[PDB]
Amino acid sequence: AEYQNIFTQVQVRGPADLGMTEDVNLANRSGVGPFSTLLGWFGNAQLGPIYLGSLGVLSLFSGLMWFFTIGIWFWYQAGWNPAVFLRDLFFFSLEPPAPEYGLSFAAPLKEGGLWLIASFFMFVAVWSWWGRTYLRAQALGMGKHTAWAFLSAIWLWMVLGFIRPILMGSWSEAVPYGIFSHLDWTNNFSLVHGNLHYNPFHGLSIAFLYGSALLFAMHGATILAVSRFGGERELEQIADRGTAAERAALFWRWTMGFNATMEGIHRWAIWMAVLVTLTGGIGILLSGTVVDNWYVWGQNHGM
Amino acid sequence: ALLSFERKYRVPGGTLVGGNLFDFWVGPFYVGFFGVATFFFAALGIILIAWSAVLQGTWNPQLISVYPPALEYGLGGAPLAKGGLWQIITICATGAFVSWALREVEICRKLGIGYHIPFAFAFAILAYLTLVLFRPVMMGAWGYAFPYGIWTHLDWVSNTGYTYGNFHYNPAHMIAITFFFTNALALALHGALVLSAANPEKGKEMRTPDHEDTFFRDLVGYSIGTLGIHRLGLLLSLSAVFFSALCMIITGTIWFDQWVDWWQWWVKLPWWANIPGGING
Amino acid sequence: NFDLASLAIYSFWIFLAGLIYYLQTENMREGYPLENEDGTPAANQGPFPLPKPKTFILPHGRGTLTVPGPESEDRPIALARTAVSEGFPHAPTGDPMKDGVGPASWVARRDLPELDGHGHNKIKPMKAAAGFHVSAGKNPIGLPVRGCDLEIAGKVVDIWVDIPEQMARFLEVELKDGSTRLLPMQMVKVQSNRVHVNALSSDLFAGIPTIKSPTEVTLLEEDKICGYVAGGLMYAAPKRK
Ligand code: BCL
Ligand code: BCL
Ligand code: BCL
Ligand code: BCL
Ligand SMILES: CC[C@H]1c2cc3[nH]c4c(c3C)C(=O)[C@H](C(=O)OC)c4c3nc(cc4[nH]c(cc(n2)[C@@H]1C)c(C(C)=O)c4C)[C@@H](C)[C@@H]3CCC(=O)OC/C=C(\C)CCC[C@H](C)CCC[C@H](C)CCCC(C)C
Ligand SMILES: CC[C@H]1c2cc3[nH]c4c(c3C)C(=O)[C@H](C(=O)OC)c4c3nc(cc4[nH]c(cc(n2)[C@@H]1C)c(C(C)=O)c4C)[C@@H](C)[C@@H]3CCC(=O)OC/C=C(\C)CCC[C@H](C)CCC[C@H](C)CCCC(C)C
Ligand SMILES: COC(C)(C)C(=O)C/C=C(\C)CC/C=C(\C)CC/C=C(\C)CCCC/C(C)=C/CC[C@H](C)CC/C=C(\C)CCC=C(C)C
Ligand SMILES: CCCCCCCC/C=C/CCCCCCCC(=O)OC[C@@H](O)COP(=O)(O)O
Ligand SMILES: CCCCCCCC/C=C/CCCCCCCC(=O)OC[C@@H](O)COP(=O)(O)O
Ligand SMILES: CCCCCCCC/C=C\CCCCCCCC(=O)OC[C@H](O)CO
Ligand SMILES: CCCCCCCCCCCC[N+](C)(C)[O-]
Ligand SMILES: CCCCCCCCCCCC[N+](C)(C)[O-]
Ligand SMILES: CCCCCCCCCCCC[N+](C)(C)[O-]
Ligand SMILES: [Fe+3]
């Protein structure tokens, strides 16, 4: 019956927090939204405000057009039958042009041309969203760590849909837009390149993906374990180390022989996560361009 | 040697067994009864691996592989060279991992902190036991467990997966992957957010947690809050491992076909299975 | 045979070694250099060097933090060695709860309140926080507070709330002499008829360190309160039967 601070016992509510202004153009910031008692059991209850602005509107417009170009194609693959649509929803796929079209933009609409159009909309949606993660931090005087971490994810996505297909010579190498089909694409990619288990950058990517769960479990549990000393107030703990920061460090020093600081655990954290897609993107980029067969390659280089 | 602030925390107490008998440190490491237990289990398990490597004829860590018994041994004991070493090493590993968790418990007690960390570590242990104990017992043979080898246990993953076609279609596996990807996304975002407030633009005072909330509200319309994000990180990572264990404990025990068949239920529902066109009619 | 994939993977592992070296030194900005158990610098500091100083400019005129920098506990530590060799416990010389050692430890933080981004006190009693109220769950105000000796130590008279995070952080508890103490929210179990506090017996509630102002709490005071209460799990434990 010792409380665990996983769910809130007593929720409290006051006036909506409108937020810091700094250099944010308040003209592009929405009103505040309603409060969610449901969310309040686990985190904050307040919804909104949200920032709009040119980049966000462009990203949202472009991202919805991506989504709609795929939807329209699904409706056409379903013969416009709504029940066929719901039935095969996970089986439809907007496929890239066939290999004979190379990198040409002359693939007919129904045979890859719509894939290129959807990809254009997706490309604008992601890069304008990236610009937004940078500008939202700038407007508040904050560091640019979010935009930089986001670039690591974008890197893997750029490699999969754009850079590797270009270096391979055809859009046909790109990932299709479908629930199951992109899973089939992923399995096929490994079989075609001689087992991605033996791509060392893929093994690293796994180490960092497993390590991200290891580390967030460690850190999430650690902070809850010292929440009885205000441990989740990490910025003031960085500015003015408290017994929460000290007990957290000593738990780990006594357990495994070394430890973090309140600030430095977040450098471990950001690097553990971004290295997932950083190494992952490298491993995919080398596949087929440089290495046709990872298992064979590994045997000739010592694996 | 101590951290500059450490001495005031190095008091007697908090042990679960043995009183003050093992209540001391070796350098930075706390010992305790379960530190002794960890050492014994780990040292013996490592000795037995060395024994297995001697029987194998290699000292190469990339080649050493300790295999479980052949399937024909069922759940029986096997001779050392033919699965017994794997069996004893598995007992030692379980012994070392559980002792590690209980040592952490003692550490939590001496420091007066919550028990969230060994509780979270227990999920990893249970996922390990799912693969070497729970699932092999339910299938009837130790030989369904994975071998202890750097590359051979990856081949086991691939052999086990492709037994069921494309393992992607395992639905608990989809949920587990979604928790793993979402966890890494949240870890990147959380690390970036704190660092972006502690290390603001040049020429700026350190930001406050209000700036963190404002940043995420501006960006996506919601901030889970500083307590919420650590709750979330723990939930995502533990849910990933829970659904990992679930996706394997059902595979070969209550599901035997190609996993892609599971969704075929949705496909062949009588009211739309025979409509021409699309994919499934 | 040493192709581009080879060059890339060996390069990444070199990068990774440098990153780990960097990350470890970054995490030595607190608590290092290591000390002997007598407080003097330890001869063996390990293979990683101390990081070069960095500076944080604190908002609200609060000054600047430089880390690493010269460290001191800035408080007396009522503990003595139990051994001449290293690695053994240091035993409390007095009352470890009152002296703030072991799991009752506190850190000499700033004797000022944490402020929000607008420079206002982050934590306020609900009676001073216009519009704040219990919005879900059992409202604990007016309930009796029970210790691990199953006896009643006082009455909940207010909730101290983190305003920016809209979170209950402390229960203000009125004792039989009419004074109050703060009880950390993470150390109470709010029930239908009572608030149960397993960490403290009823007679230890008045030992909770007091706050010097009725409407605010300083970081120093929060550390003394939170340390004292958590210390009860070990030091009030002979009363938990
Ligand atoms: C989890 C689901 C599968 C599985 C699927 C995969 C796949 C797929 C991959 C790995 C990879 C690895 N796995 Mg495996 N792995 C399993 C179970 C295990 C267990 C275990 C006791 O359960 C262990 C110790 C390992 C260990 C390892 C490492 C050799 C490597 C990097 C992991 C990592 O950084 O994780 C996160 C953890 C950390 C960052 C913390 C540090 C962990 C260190 C590196 C562990 C060293 C273990 C040591 C070599 C063996 C025991 C040492 C004893 C002293 C004898 N696996 C099961 C069977 N594993 C990758 C690889 O490169 O393999 C060659 C890879 O591609
Ligand atoms: C049969 C299948 C093959 C195989 C084929 C592949 C292939 C092919 C790939 C991987 C990749 C990965 N694999 Mg593998 N994989 C196998 C076996 C494994 C095993 C295992 C237990 O055996 C494990 C643990 C893994 C694990 C991993 C990950 C470490 C890695 C993906 C990282 C990531 O975050 O991607 C997810 C993150 C992203 C895709 C980035 C996304 C960023 C963009 C910008 C997001 C856009 C959002 C968009 C606009 C939509 C918005 C929606 C609105 C919000 C509503 N694989 C086997 C051998 N694997 C990838 C990799 O890096 O390989 C080196 C990869 O390409
Ligand atoms: C890494 C190697 C492979 C790959 C291998 C796998 C495997 C294997 C699995 C997935 C899984 C998923 N992948 Mg994939 N995946 C790849 C690249 C992508 C890209 C991309 C931009 O490149 C996208 C958008 C997705 C999207 C998705 C989701 C459908 C799902 C959960 C992801 C997740 O946890 O996100 C974390 C992010 C968030 C939680 C934020 C919100 C994200 C939302 C939900 C994304 C919506 C996308 C899409 C528009 C949804 C339409 C739904 C209905 C059809 C209308 N993948 C590459 C090519 N992916 C899992 C799954 O369930 O598959 C069915 C799974 O098992
Ligand atoms: C060809 C292979 C198949 C496939 C077949 C399988 C099989 C088979 C399995 C998985 C499992 C998993 N797969 Mg799959 N998988 C494929 C493709 C993928 C892709 C992808 C992008 O395509 C992804 C992301 C995944 C993802 C995943 C995870 C959901 C899960 C692994 C994590 C886990 O269980 O941790 C759990 C964590 C542990 C087991 C670690 C335990 C650690 C212990 C407690 C402590 C060790 C201490 C150590 C010895 C100390 C050393 C010394 C110190 C370091 C000093 N797979 C393809 C389609 N996958 C596995 C699973 O769910 O397992 C339950 C599994 O068995
Ligand atoms: C290792 C790095 C990890 C990572 C990092 C990362 N991702 C990030 C970031 C970072 C640091 C961001 O800053 C950024 C972000 O903003 O996060 C909150 C992002 C983000 N990562 C995302 C997704 C994502 N990340 C993933 C992975 C990871 N990201 C890695 C694990 C994955 C996968 C496959 O695992 C996914 C799916 C997004 C949540 C976000 C990027 C947002 C973006 O680019 O959006 C562009 C698109 C739109 C604005 C709109 C698209 C339209 C919708 C699909 C509409 C559907 C609903 C409905 C039809 C609406 C109808 C309305 C009608 C009224 C018209
Ligand atoms: C549940 C969420 C995630 C999680 C959580 C987690 N792990 C944890 C903790 C937590 C909260 C700890 O407190 C604990 C720790 O101290 O971390 C620093 C731990 C830890 N997780 C570890 C590893 C680890 N965690 C993993 C995963 C995860 N850990 C999950 C994704 C993985 C993988 C593969 O994904 C690995 C490899 C260790 C760093 C540590 C546990 C240390 C420990 O138990 O030490 C005692 C034992 C020894 C020192 C050695 C024992 C040797 C054996 C007797 C012989 C070898 C047997 C083994 C089966 C051989 C395998 C060979 C491989 C090639 C397959
Ligand atoms: C009710 O129905 C309506 C019609 C209203 C709908 O809207 C329904 C909508 C749906 C059902 C949506 C269905 C959507 C999906 C199934 C999405 C699934 C997507 C994935 C699983 C993601 C797969 C991976 C995608 C990747 C890797 C894309 C890479 C993109 C490239 C990096 C971009 C490259 C750019 C190109 C090729 C164009 C070049 C042009 C330039 C200007 C550079
Ligand atoms: C050829 C293959 C190489 C990879 C190709 C490009 C891939 C793009 C990836 C980008 C790097 C990964 C993210 C960096 C780590 C996370 C951010 C970080 O910790 O550093 C940023 C930090 O200073 C703060 O920024 P400022 O506020 O501007 O100082
Ligand atoms: C064994 C030691 C040497 C290993 C071999 C040589 C290493 C080769 C390459 C390694 C370099 C990896 C460095 C990664 C981290 C880069 C430092 C960094 O991040 O700088 C920016 C930072 O200041 C400001 O960040 P913020 O304060 O967060 O804005
Ligand atoms: C009116 C607008 C409608 C509202 C739409 C709701 C969308 C919610 C989406 C994601 C929340 C999960 C965020 C997970 C990542 C958080 C990173 C972090 O550290 O947050 C800490 C906290 O937010 C500060 O300290
Ligand atoms: C706003 C749309 C963005 C277009 C960029 C991608 C070009 C697609 C070309 C499709 C070709 C169709 N057609 C008939 C010319 O063959
Ligand atoms: C930022 C955290 C650093 C953690 C580094 C983890 C190293 C794991 C080693 C995995 C080995 C992968 N591979 C294929 C190259 O052998
Ligand atoms: C693979 C990720 C683990 C990286 C390990 C970093 C080890 C750092 C050990 C530093 C020793 C600390 N000490 C005891 C000298 O203070
Ligand atoms: Fe944190």
Q: How far is CA B197 from the centre of its chain?
A: 31
Q: How far apart are CA C125 and CA C131, in angstroms?
A: 12
- State the smallest CA–CA distance between residue B49 and chain C in angstroms: 27
Q: Does C213 map to a domain?
A: yes
The DSSP letter of residue A44 is -
**Structure tokens, B211:** 């700036």
B192 lines ligand 9 (CB under 6 A): no
Calculate the CA dihedral of residues A240, A245, A249, A250 and round it to 10 degrees. Answer: 110
CB pairs under 8 A between A and B: 334
Please give the C-alpha separations between residue A210 and each of A276, B135, B180, C156, in angstroms, as whole numbers: 9, 21, 8, 45
**d(C-alpha B96, C-alpha B90), whole Å:** 10
Question: Is C41 in the same domain as C75?
Answer: yes
Report yes or no: C194 and C146 within 8 Å, Cβ to Cβ.
Answer: yes
User: Would the CA dihedral through C86, C92, C96, C101 be positive or negative?
Assistant: negative
Listed in sequence order, the residues at least 6 apart from A107 whose beta carbon sits closer than 8 Å to its beta carbon are: A97, A98, A101, A113, A115, A116, A171
Measured between alpha carbons, how far is B219 from A130 in angstroms, rounded to an integer? 11
Exposure string over C183-197, b if 16+ CB within 10 A, otherwise e: bbbbbbebeeebbbb
Tokens read off for A301: 């280089």
Q: For chain B, what's the residue count?
A: 281
Chain B residue whose CA is closest to C226 = B112
What is the distance between the alpha carbons of residues A183 and B18, in angstroms, rounded to a whole number?
53
User: What are the two backbone dihedrals, phi and then psi, of residue B46, each rounded to the nearest 5 degrees?
Assistant: -70, -40
Asked whether C160 and C134 are in contact (CB, 8 A), the reply is: no
Q: Which residues line ligand 5 (CB under 6 A)?
A: A 59-60, 63-64, 67, 125-126, 129, 133, 146, 149-150, 152-153, 273-274, 276-277; B 181, 184-185, 188-189, 192, 219-220
What are the Cα distances from residue C126, in Å, to C65, C114, C159, C168? 32, 17, 6, 9
Alpha-carbon distance of A231 to A253, in angstroms, equals 17
Residues A253, B27 contacting (CB under 8 angstroms):
no
Cα distances (angstroms) measured from residue C90 to each of B8, B111, C192, C230, C234: 8, 14, 42, 19, 15
Q: How many CB atoms lie within 10 A of CB B246?
A: 18
Facing residues of C63 across strands? C58
CA–CA distance, A76 with A114 (Å, rounded to integer): 12
Cα torsion B45, B46, B49, B55: sign: negative
Closest CA to B272 of C15, A91, C92, A138: A91
Q: For testing the chain B interface, which of C44, C86, C186, C198 should be mutated: the one with the most B CBs within 10 Å?
A: C86
Residues C151 and C86 in one domain: no
CA distance C159 to C133: 9
Instruction: Give A 209-238 residues with CB within 8 A of chain C.
Output: 227-230, 233, 236, 238
In terms of DSSP bridges, do strands B29-30 and C167-175 run parallel, antiparallel, or are they unpaired?
Answer: unpaired
Which of C54, C71, C92 is the last residue before a domain boundary? C92
| Dihedral angle of Cα A149, A153, A156, A160, to the nearest 10 degrees | -150
**Total of domains in chain C:** 2
- Cβ(C230)–Cβ(A242) below 8 Å: no
Q: Which residues pair with B251 in a beta bridge?
A: B255
Same domain, C111 and C137: yes
**Breaks in chain C follow which residues, C to N over 2.5 Å?**
none
Asked if residue A263 lies in contact with residue A168, where contact means CB atoms within 8 angstroms, the answer is: no
Q: Counting beta carbons within 10 angstroms of the beta carbon of residue B275, is it exposed (0 to 12), middle (13 to 18) or buried (19 or more)? A: middle
Separation CA A47–CA A35 (nearest Å): 6
B277 and A81 in contact (C-beta within 8 Å)? yes
Residues in chain A with CB shorter than 8 Å from the CB of B14 are: none
Burial pattern C75-110, b for ≥16 Cβ within 10 A else e, equals eebbbeebeeebebbbbbeeebbebbbbbbbbbbbb
Q: Answer yes or no: are the C-beta atoms of C178 and C185 closer than 8 Å.
A: no
Give the closest ligand to the alpha carbon of residue A103. 7
Between A and C, how many residue pairs show a Cβ–Cβ distance under 8 A?
169
Residues ≥6 apart with Cβ < 8 Å to B33: B15, B16, B17, B18, B21, B22, B106
- Which residue, among C22, C29, C35, would best test binding to B if mutated, counting the most B CBs under 10 Å from its CB? C35
Closest approach of C221 to chain B, Cα-based (Å): 18
Cα separation, B97 vs B102, in Å, equals 9
Strand (E) or helix (H) holding A204? helix A200-225
Burial of B84 (0-12, 13-18, 19+ CB in 10 A): middle
Residue C138 lies in domain:
102-239
Amino acid sitting at position C86 = E
Question: Strand, coil or helix: what is B26?
Answer: strand
DSSP string, A255-267: HHS----TTTHHH
Residue B183 CA, ligand 3 centroid: distance in Å: 13
Side-chain-side CA neighbours of A86 within 13 Å: the count stands at 6
In a 3-state reduction of DSSP, which class is residue B5? coil
Give ∠ CA A23-A29-A32 in degrees, rounded to 5. 125
CA A272 / ligand 8 centre spacing (Å) = 13
Do C112 and C88 belong to one domain? no
Decide whether any atom of ligand 13 lies within 6 Å of the A7 Cβ: no
- Same-domain pairing of C42 and C84: yes
Domain-located, residue C97: no
Q: For residue A188, how many other CB atoms are within 10 A of its CB? A: 11
Count of CB atoms situated within 10 Å of the CB of C69: 10
Strands B29-30 and B25-26: antiparallel
SS3 category, C122: coil
Question: Is C204 in contact with C147 (CB distance < 8 Å)?
Answer: yes
- Alpha-carbon distance of C76 to C98, in angstroms, equals 12
Dist CA C85 CA B27 (whole Å): 11
Q: What is the helix (H) or strand (E) element at residue A216, kind and residue range?
A: helix A200-225
Helix, strand, or coil (residue C136): strand
A251/B107 Cβ within 8 A: yes
What is the distance between the alpha carbons of residues A248 and A259, in angstroms, rounded to a whole number? 9
How far away, in angstroms, is A266 Cα from ligand 3 center? 26
CA distance B266 to chain C (A): 40
Which amino acid type is present at position C19? L
Residue C54 has φ and ψ, to the nearest 5°, of -125, 165
Which residues in C129-150 are b (16+ Cβ under 10 Å) and which e? beebebbbbeebbebbbbbbbe
Q: Collapse the DSSP code of A78 into the 3-class scheme (helix H, G, I; strand E, B; otherwise coil) and give the result.
A: coil
Query: E strands, chain B, where?
Result: 25-26, 29-30, 65-66, 148-149
Domain CATH for C57: 4.10.540.10
Question: What is the SS3 assignment for A186?
Answer: helix
Which CB contacts under 8 angstroms, 24+ apart, belong to B82-86? B83/B142, B83/B143, B85/B48, B85/B49, B85/B51, B85/B52, B85/B55, B86/B52, B86/B142, B86/B145, B86/B147, B86/B148
User: B194 in ligand 6 pocket by Cβ < 6 Å?
Assistant: no
Q: Is C184 on the interface with A (CB under 8 A)?
A: yes
Tokens of A230: 């205000």
Q: Where are the beta strands (DSSP E) in chain C?
A: 54-58, 63-67, 79-81, 90-92, 123-125, 133-136, 144-146, 152-162, 167-175, 180-184, 189-190, 195-196
Cα dihedral across residues A291, A295, A300, A301: positive or negative: positive
Nearest Cα to A255, choosing from B259, B47, B110, B203? Answer: B110
Q: How far apart are CA B123 and CA B239, in angstroms?
A: 9
Residues C107 and C78 in one domain: no
Give the span between the Cα atoms of A257 and A248, in whole angstroms: 13
Half-sphere exposure of B182 (CA within 13 A, CB side): 17
Whether C226 is covered by a domain: the verdict is: yes
In 3D space, the residue among A155, A116, A163 whose CA is nearest the CA of residue A289 turns out to be A163
Q: What Cα–Cα distance (Å) separates residue A24 from each residue in B219, C149, C199?
A: 12, 54, 46
Structure tokens at B279: 């994919």
Distance CA A294, CA C189 (A): 56
- List the domains of chain A with CATH numbers: 1-51 (no CATH), 53-192 (1.20.85.10)
Q: Are residues C153 and C115 both part of a single domain?
A: yes
Q: Do C24 and C136 fall into the same domain?
A: no
- Ligand 4 pocket mutation pick from A157, A186, A197, A256 by most atoms within 8 angstroms of CB: A186
| End-to-end alpha carbon distance in chain A | 51
Quick one: which of A162, A156, A58, A67 has its CA closest to A118?
Answer: A67
So where are chain B's domains? 1-163, 164-263
Q: What is the dihedral of CA A125, A126, A129, A131, to 10 degrees?
A: -110
CA distances from C142 to B198, C52, C148, C156 (A): 40, 53, 19, 5
- Candidates A196, A199, A206, A208: which one to mutate for ligand 1, based on the most atoms within 8 Å of Cβ? A206
Distance, in Å, from the CA atom of A46 to the CA atom of A16, rounded to the nearest integer, reads 7
Spatial separation of the C-alpha atoms in residues A157 and A126, rounded to whole Å? 10
Radius of gyration over every alpha carbon of chain C, rounded to an integer in angstroms: 23
C206 and C124 housed in the same domain: yes
Give me the residue label for tokens 């409706």. A75
Residue whose tokens read 């989740």: A232
Residue C21 has which token pair? 């070296």
Q: What is the DSSP string of B61-81?
A: TTT-EEPPPPGGGTTS---GG
Element (H, E) at A124: helix A113-139
Distance CA C184, CA C197 (A): 10
Bridge pairing between strands B65-66 and C90-92: unpaired
CA distance B162 to B55: 30
A106: Cβ contacts below 8 Å, ≥ 6 apart? none
Contact C185, C173 (CB under 8 A): no
Separation CA A267–CA B237 (nearest Å): 19
Task: Measure the CA–CA gap between B169 and B173, rounded to whole angstroms.
Answer: 8
- What count of residues does chain C have? 241
Q: Dig out the tokens for B27 from the structure.
A: 């350098």
Helix, strand or coil, per DSSP, at residue B2 = strand
Q: Compute the distance between CA of residue B75 and CA of residue B141 in angstroms, rounded to an integer.
A: 5
Residue C114 lies in a domain: yes
* Nearest C-alpha in A relative to C20: A268
User: Cα(A73)–Cα(A177) distance, rounded to whole angstroms?
Assistant: 10
Greatest CA separation for chain A: 67
Burial of B61 (0-12, 13-18, 19+ CB in 10 A): exposed
Judgement on whether residues C114 and C164 belong to the same structural domain of the protein = yes
Q: What is the resolution of this structure in A?
A: 2.1
Q: Which experimental method was this entry solved with?
A: X-ray
